Design a protein around this ligand. Structure first.
Ligand code: MG
Lengths: 52, 48, 225, 53, 94, 48, 224
């Protein structure tokens, strides 16, 4: 369980790039600060769905 | 009624029994990640 | 079982405060936040103006000659008045105000009544000019919640205008539930309670009174039949 | 006729009026003939930007 | 949004110059172990850890907050590259 | 493996309405009938 | 307002009605909902957590002479209601030994001290002539819903973890009427309806729910 605590310190301040195909415009790739969540699905903000 | 507050929903809600299917596309079989792994023979690029 | 949560308070001034309770079991932020908000907005004892009498005024939709504010605006300012009774046995007082133009009438212009404190003496009531006379008698009661003027319909004398009684000192309640973790438990709840109060009572006191009211009602489930 | 948005929304919380009922609310020093929901929407924008004017 | 991003964009004529300054400053901070920082001890970025409140290891976060203070000088042909690297090592040993 | 329904699994009905499970709520959080029966699935009316 | 009268109407050990009147306007929801949320979530009870069947290695197998497979048998065992008559009892193992042809029910478990089966007529498996069913069902005490993947309790090598639903409360509804006292007619009459599996009576579940809420209200005492 201490590994998961160390993973939080790894991703602190860092961002990841989220991309949905097809990338018709540049906002098809956007940077988000990842929040670690239980499960296997990526949680996406409702307000960026239109751009993607 | 709203289970969180106990107050009713301000308008009547269409509530009924409907037949819903669970499809073969599951996030368990679709989630994938890789840091480093196998590479191509010629292009030396990561496999897919 | 989950460890007892930490109750942290962030109170600024005497009219606003934030209270955080974490960690909580899943769903207990909603379980606790909603009852307290309902009690805070409807059950905290307070004082309010319930009737006003102004000389030479017949109806609420009229206006006094010699003052910028009409009857409605003065009534609206009266609803902003915050008064705190210093005597627990005291139930109702009447505040007298005699003003001559061209002064700006304030809440401090009310005649001092024993065991009666005006929390906001800088509140603006009316603005007078030369030849303007404002003779006003306001009736202050004790109660809870919000009561429309037409509901209680309190009149001390003829031509008295009933006014909406904002008894509750709590101006606004907003509670937020956030997901928190304690080790490998990830479904825990973080409850943040934000209370706005008129200043007669501290938001900490309002929360304490609301918790006591909820606690007292839980003792009602004691003696069957 | 409500003296402030807090009083208008307190009446809504107490069930006297709905968010869509047109009432009189004094806001920004002006006597507005609007609904508490429209007044509520104004407070949403004001608090989000932390600037009421 | 990044804190003070509007102020960061207003200090540069081209938005990509801001990124270059932040990224170059971040590697300067990483190279010297954050000992060359212009931030006061009460101004250092922090992260919440179970053990306690510790310094933020993300140098990009440090670089952005340093630029907001105004103690950093950026531009073209300010100092020779060789002179800059050598002098920083002397006054900030690592 | 015995797979239970989880967040990200795709549900659908016979009328073309499809979607992935995005939230699993406890029983006390779901909307319920006045007799105390909670609903099982909440569907967005905007998809109709 | 004066102290409300509390009225209890019970239909056996599984259903009960609790009336609290008169209450101030708004206290029907203010009191009913928090209890309903606590009743539906945080009431301790007993549930089957692990089952071991002789000559069975996993739950994805069938037993000769038994009509139902292990998955269906485990589904039947999840409906077993076990009442611990001893408050200190935390774990019990129920032993079932049956030989075909018979319809083995929940009443066929070997008797255990301070343990009562609230649904003896529950069907577990159908035994055909020449079929045998030797099971060791472990019943634990807990709260909430614990999937088998979390607790992973295996009393022995071939024991099969079972998803555990410890909550005895089956359904909660609360009802608010227009009651009147004196000259004021906005008062609330709150009626709590509790359905329980029978291991815990609805009166006990209500008492525990009140205590849980009362304890949580003591968390607002010491500011930091
Ligand atoms: Mg059960």
């Amino acid at each position: 369980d201490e590994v998961w605590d160390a993973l939080e310190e790894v991703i602190h301040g860092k961002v990841v790039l989220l991309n949905r195909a097809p990338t018709l415009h540049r906002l098809g790739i956007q940077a988000f600060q990842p929040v670690l969540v239980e499960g296997q699905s990526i949680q996406l903000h409702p307000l960026v769905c239109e751009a993607f | 009624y709203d289970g969180r507050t106990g107050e009713p929903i301000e308008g009547p809600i269409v509530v009924g029994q409907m037949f819903i299917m669970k499809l073969y596309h599951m996030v368990e079989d679709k989630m994938h990640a890789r840091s480093t792994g196998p590479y191509s023979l010629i292009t030396q690029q990561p496999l897919g | 079982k989950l460890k007892a949560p930490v109750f942290t308070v962030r109170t600024q001034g005497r009219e606003y405060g934030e209270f955080v309770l974490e960690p909580l079991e899943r769903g207990f932020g909603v379980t606790l936040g909603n009852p307290l908000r309902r009690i805070l907005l409807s059950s905290i004892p307070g004082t309010a103006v319930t009737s006003v009498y102004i000389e030479d005024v017949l109806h609420e939709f009229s206006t006094i000659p010699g003052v910028k504010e009409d009857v409605v605006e003065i009534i609206l300012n009266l609803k902003e008045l915050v008064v705190r009774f210093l005597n627990p046995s005291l139930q109702t007082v009447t505040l007298l105000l005699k003003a001559e133009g061209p002064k700006e009438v304030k809440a401090r212009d009310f005649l001092p009544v024993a065991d009666v404190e005006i929390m906001n003496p800088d509140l603006h009531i009316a603005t007078l000019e030369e030849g303007g006379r404002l003779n006003m008698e306001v009736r202050v009661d004790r109660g809870v919640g919000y009561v429309p003027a037409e509901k209680h319909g309190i009149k001390d004398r003829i031509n008295a205008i009933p006014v909406d009684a904002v008894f509750s000192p709590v101006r606004r309640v907003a509670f937020q539930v956030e997901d928190t973790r304690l080790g490998q438990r990830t479904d825990l709840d973080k409850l943040t309670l934000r209370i706005w109060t008129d200043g007669s009572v501290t938001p900490l006191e309002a929360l304490n009174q609301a918790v006591e009211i909820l606690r007292e009602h839980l003792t009602y489930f004691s003696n069957p039949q | 006729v409500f003296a402030n948005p807090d009083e208008a929304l307190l009446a809504v919380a107490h069930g006297i009026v709905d968010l869509q009922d047109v009432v009189t609310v004094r806001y920004m020093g002006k006597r507005l003939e609007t609904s508490p929901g429209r007044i509520l929407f104004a407070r949403i924008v004001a608090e989000a930007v932390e600037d009421e004017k | 949004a990044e804190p003070g991003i509007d102020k960061l964009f207003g200090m540069v004529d081209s938005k990509y110059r801001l990124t270059v300054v932040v990224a170059k400053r971040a590697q300067q901070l990483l190279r010297h172990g954050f000992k060359n920082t212009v931030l006061e001890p009460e101004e250092r970025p922090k992260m919440q850890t179970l053990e306690g409140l510790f310094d933020d290891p993300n140098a990009v976060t440090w670089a952005m907050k340093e630029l907001l203070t105004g103690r950093l000088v950026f531009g073209e042909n300010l100092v020779p590259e060789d002179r800059l690297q050598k002098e920083m090592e002397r006054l900030y040993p690592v | 493996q015995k797979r239970k329904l989880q967040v990200g699994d795709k549900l659908a009905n016979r009328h073309g309405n499809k979607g992935v499970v995005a939230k699993i709520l406890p029983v006390e959080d779901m909307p319920h009938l006045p007799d105390g029966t909670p609903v099982d699935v909440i569907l967005n009316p905007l998809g109709v």
